[PDB]
Ligand binder design. Structure first.
Ligand SMILES: Nc1ncnc2c1ncn2[C@@H]1O[C@H](COP(=O)(O)O)[C@@H](O)[C@H]1O
Lengths: 239, 366
């Protein structure tokens, strides 16, 4: 078993390969060129009935975004490009143009979200698979935060997100999770303030964090991060 | 080569009784956990001891003495309380950038010497700093700490007398910290004469291993086929960033522009570049601007194998010795071998007594 080298339609494989190649090449410099090519692959769906190739492209952007958090926001832009510039003639038997892709984004966070993950972790056997489970889950919450910020997602998915994080925040939170919450609140906290409910959810959340600061035993570094969003939201008012 | 005589390691910055304003500085700069030297030498310096550190560059030297010094500063006293010395203005400008960055949340002025009677930390080169003391341009009576970075380079750039002078112009109880990659007779002379019972710390660079990384090969058979295999590699597996090594500068550059035509974002380094130019290329790549770095071998030595998952030996190392320097520590090494490269790849096979299985169709997973 050895790896072997070597008006248009593409089978699953041909669409996963071109997409790997296009997602690996995505940089700030080469963005317009490469988000244009990823959109021609998405656009193939004019010649389809159930939007299968475009569903497939969204799903791959999420898989990429979730494993390459450092670029979550650039991938989040790629999506905004697909929503904005998708061919409107496109139809899916199961909403067209932008409103179609928008619904695709949501449906795919729900899918990836529902899989779930655990905060507390046990180099070991299935232990690698579960560090990647958390890493990828947290990479997703992060990616949600960048989609929400471009208004490519509604608050309902941001509630479900904070809802999940708050759950782990009350059961002895790991430092990666706390890291995740801060970064999310820094990205999306102001905007979320007003969304239906939403200021009231932050109220609960910041009360869990005040507790964590005033009781839990955490690195100074993280304790400094928590004290800083707390002052940013409460005293400085995000300004 | 000097021997250690201090047995106290502190692993976390939290355990170093630093001032909050300074702790915020260190974290908000990128440091999270102290490197080797920093674990061992921050605390002795803070506690008042003369510290003699033999450490290579890129070990966290500047951060060791910058943190110790800030902690020791008295914000009440608005005068030079520490002097940092370096061989070059480039190097003293670096040290200043760092000292300032760690100091963001404290009220401490840092002046560079290449309006300094009110700086609390002073940084410069030995000549300019001598001239300025002599011209009574900066108050030295509050100086409590004298840090000589890269003492070997300072002595080897004709700074012996300036330094000897400086030693004698500072308060006779000034604490001395001397850092040097090498400890030749000349530098030990400064040590025996100007230091008192120093804490001696030796940090030896960690030996590279192959155990960490999984290595593979791809028989491209012929040279004309190498490129086509690289592009298909990028259809097959998911990459964050990669390093690619070629033997010559010519191929580095030819490969670089071939990849840009295929819309890759790539960085190239080779020997003839200014050390400053390479430094920028590497820094900008390690920060995510480009996603591929192509490099020759002559500088597989100064290179920093960060969390880069994937390393591709597009050319096979003409010198057996540099295969460790290209792919040494977890990650992945993939070598391109042609028909003539096979006997060469048997050399590597047995030189490291290492195993390099052929690239499996199942990798997108691994
Ligand atoms: N505690 C630390 N954590 C991570 N990186 C560090 C730390 N201290 C120093 N460095 C890095 O080490 C490099 C060279 O350090 P130096 O040995 O001070 O010249 C710099 O690029 C720093 O970013």
């Amino acid at each position: 078993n050895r790896w072997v080298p070597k008006t248009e339609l593409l089978d699953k494989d041909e669409v996963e390969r071109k997409m790997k190649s296009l997602l690996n090449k995505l940089t700030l410099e080469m963005f317009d060129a490469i988000s244009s090519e990823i959109l021609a692959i998405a656009n193939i769906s004019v010649w389809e009935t159930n939007g299968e190739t475009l569903k497939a492209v969204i799903e791959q952007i999420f898989l990429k975004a979730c494993d390459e958090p450092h670029w979550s926001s650039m991938y989040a832009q790629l999506c905004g490009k697909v929503v904005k510039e998708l061919n409107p003639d496109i139809t899916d038997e199961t909403k067209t143009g932008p409103k179609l892709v928008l619904h695709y984004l949501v449906a795919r966070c729900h899918a990836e979200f529902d899989k779930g993950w655990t905060d507390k972790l046990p180099m070991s056997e299935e232990y690698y698979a579960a560090a990647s489970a958390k890493r990828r889950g947290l990479g997703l919450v992060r990616f949600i935060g960048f989609l929400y910020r471009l208004n490519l997602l509604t608050g309902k998915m941001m509630f479900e997100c904070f809802r999940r994080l708050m759950k782990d925040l009350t059961d002895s939170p790991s430092e990666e999770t706390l890291e995740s919450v801060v970064e999310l609140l820094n990205t999306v906290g102001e905007q979320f303030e007003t969304d239906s409910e939403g200021s009231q959810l932050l109220d609960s959340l910041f009360g869990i964090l005040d507790n964590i600061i005033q009781t839990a035993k955490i690195s100074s570094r993280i304790k400094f991060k928590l004290i800083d969003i707390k002052e940013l939201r409460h005293d400085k008012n995000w300004n | 080569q000097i021997q250690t005589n201090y047995d106290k390691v502190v692993y976390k910055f939290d355990d170093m009784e630093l001032d909050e304003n300074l702790l915020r500085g260190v974290f908000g700069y990128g440091f999270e956990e102290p490197s080797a030297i920093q674990q061992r030498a921050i605390m002795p310096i803070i506690e008042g001891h003369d510290v003699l550190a033999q450490a290579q560059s890129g070990t966290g030297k500047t951060g060791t003495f910058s943190i110790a010094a800030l902690q020791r500063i008295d914000t009440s006293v608005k005068a030079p309380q520490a002097l940092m010395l370096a061989p070059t203005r480039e190097l003293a400008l670096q040290i200043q950038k760092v000292v300032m960055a760690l100091a963001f949340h404290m009220d401490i002025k840092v002046h560079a010497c290449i309006g300094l009677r009110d700086a609390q930390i002073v940084v410069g080169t030995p000549g300019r700093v001598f001239d300025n003391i002599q011209r009574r341009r900066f108050r030295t009576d509050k100086i409590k700490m004298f840090i000589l970075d890269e003492a070997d380079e300072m002595l080897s750039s004709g700074f012996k007398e300036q330094i000897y002078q400086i030693f004698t112009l500072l308060p006779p109880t000034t604490q001395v910290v001397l850092l040097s990659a090498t400890m030749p007779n000349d530098v030990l002379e400064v040590t025996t004469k100007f230091m008192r019972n120093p804490v001696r710390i030796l940090v030896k660079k960690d030996e590279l291993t192959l155990e960490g990384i999984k290595q593979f090969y791809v028989n491209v058979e012929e040279e004309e086929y190498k490129y086509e295999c690289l592009t298909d590699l990028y259809d097959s597996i998911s990459v964050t960033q990669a390093v690619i090594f070629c033997n010559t500068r010519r191929k580095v550059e030819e490969l670089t522009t071939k990849l840009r035509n295929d819309k890759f974002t790539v960085s190239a380094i080779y020997s003839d570049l200014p050390q400053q130019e390479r430094d920028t290329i590497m820094k900008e790549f390690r920060s995510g601007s480009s996603r591929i770095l192509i490099s020759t071998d002559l500088l597989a030595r100064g290179i920093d194998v960060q969390q880069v998952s994937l390393v591709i030996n597009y050319d096979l190392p003409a010198n057996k010795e540099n295969y460790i320097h290209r792919i040494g520590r977890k990650g992945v090494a993939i070598n391109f071998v042609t028909n003539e490269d096979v006997g060469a790849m048997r050399e590597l096979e047995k030189f490291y007594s290492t195993q390099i299985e052929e690239l499996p169709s199942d990798i997108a997973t691994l």
